[PDB]
C-alpha cells in the first residue's frame, strides 16, 4: 500500500514529575488498542488524574492535552502498589476511548475523545521537528525527573513520619527537619540533579532520631 490510516502522533498520559508516557506510538495503524498498568505516586493516595496527551515530547507540558479525568476510591496502600490499568482504544472512526480501572476496588472511569481533537497537520509537523531538536534535552529532563521524584518521595515520607511521631521528636530535631524539608522543596523546583540529592542528604543528616522513633 501507498496509503495507511494512522495516529500521526504518540498518545499517552502524564506520569509523576510531568513526564509523558506513551501508550500508542506515533504512526500506529488504526484501529488499535493498548493497555498498561500504572500506580500511585504517593502512599495512601486515594485518587489519580489521567491526563491524556498527544505528542512526542518527554515533557508532558509540551504535548497537546486531549482531555482529563479522575479515578477515585483507591484504597489505602503504599505508593506503587495499587494497579491502575489504563487502556487506550482507537476505533476505525478515529474516536479515542480511554479508560482507567483500579484492579482492587474494581472502580473504573472512562472518556471519549473525538477524532478531530488535538493537533492539526501543521502542528503535527512542528511537533515532530520540535521533538527531534529537543531529543537530548528531553533525555536530560527524564534523568532530572527521576531524582526529583526520589526527592518528592523522601519529602512525603519524612513529613508523614514527623507527624506520626509528633511529641517524641525533640524540638531541636523538628526545627532542623522543617528547615531541611523546605530546602529540599525549593531544590526540587530546579533542574540541578546534584542540588536535589544534596538537599536530600541534608535532610537525612537531621532525621536520624526521627528514623529511630519511626522505626
Amino acid at each position: 500500500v501507498l496509503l495507511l490510516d494512522v495516529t500521526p502522533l504518540s498518545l499517552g498520559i502524564e506520569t509523576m514529575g510531568g513526564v509523558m508516557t506513551t501508550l500508542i506510538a506515533k504512526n500506529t495503524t488504526i484501529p488499535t488498542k493498548h493497555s498498561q498498568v500504572f500506580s500511585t505516586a504517593e502512599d495512601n493516595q486515594s485518587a489519580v488524574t489521567i491526563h491524556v496527551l498527544q505528542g512526542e515530547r518527554k515533557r508532558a507540558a509540551d504535548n497537546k492535552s486531549l482531555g482529563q479525568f479522575n479515578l477515585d476510591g483507591i484504597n489505602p496502600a503504599p505508593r506503587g502498589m495499587p494497579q491502575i490499568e489504563v487502556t487506550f482504544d482507537i476505533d476505525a472512526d478515529g474516536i479515542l476511548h480511554v479508560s482507567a480501572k483500579d484492579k482492587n476496588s474494581g472502580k473504573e472511569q472512562k472518556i471519549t475523545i473525538k477524532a478531530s481533537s488535538g493537533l492539526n497537520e501543521d502542528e503535527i509537523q512542528k511537533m515532530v521537528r520540535d521533538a527531534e531538536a529537543n531529543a537530548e534535552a528531553d533525555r536530560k529532563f527524564e534523568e532530572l525527573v527521576q531524582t526529583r521524584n526520589q526527592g518528592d518521595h523522601l519529602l512525603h515520607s519524612t513529613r508523614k513520619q514527623v507527624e506520626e511521631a509528633g511529641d517524641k521528636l525533640p524540638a531541636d530535631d523538628k526545627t532542623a527537619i522543617e528547615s531541611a524539608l523546605t530546602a529540599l522543596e525549593t531544590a526540587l523546583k530546579g533542574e540541578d540533579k546534584a542540588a536535589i540529592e544534596a538537599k536530600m542528604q541534608e535532610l537525612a543528616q537531621v532525621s536520624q532520631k526521627l528514623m529511630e522513633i519511626a522505626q
Binding site: 500504572f38 489519580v48 488524574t49 521524584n149
Partner: peptide, 9 residues
C-alpha cells in the same frame, strides 16, 4: 516499567 500517576488538581 511501572510509572506512577499524580493526585488530582
Amino acid at each position: 516499567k511501572l510509572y506512577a500517576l499524580p493526585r488530582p488538581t
